[PDB]
Amino acid sequence: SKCKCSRKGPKIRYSDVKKLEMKPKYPHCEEKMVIITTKSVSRYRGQEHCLHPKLQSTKRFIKWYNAWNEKRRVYEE
Numbered sequence: 001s002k003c004k005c006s007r008k009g010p011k012i013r014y015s016d017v018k019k020l021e022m023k024p025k026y027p028h029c030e031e032k033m034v035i036i037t038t039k040s041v042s043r044y045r046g047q048e049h050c051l052h053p054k055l056q057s058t059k060r061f062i063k064w065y066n067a068w069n070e071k072r073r074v075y076e077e
Helices: 056-072
Strands: 016-021 034-039 048-051
Touching: 016 056, 034 056
Parallel strands: none
Antiparallel strands: 016 034, 034 048
16 A cells, blocks of 8 residues: 655755655555655745655665765764
8 A cells, every 4th residue: 555655746855855754654555655854945845745665766865865964964074
């Protein structure tokens, strides 16, 4: 049973993401969905995006965000 998040929703940039959490849109879905919280000025303002983690495009964006988040949380040393 998959809950619809389409794929990634409106195109998110890494710069939009403040926080990335894995939790399903619906508990009746397989695995945790990927939840993306935006910074402010995003077309999706006040809503969290959800990527459906069954897709390959999710993997890079998420993985890439984990690297990018390290720069925003500031691990630059």
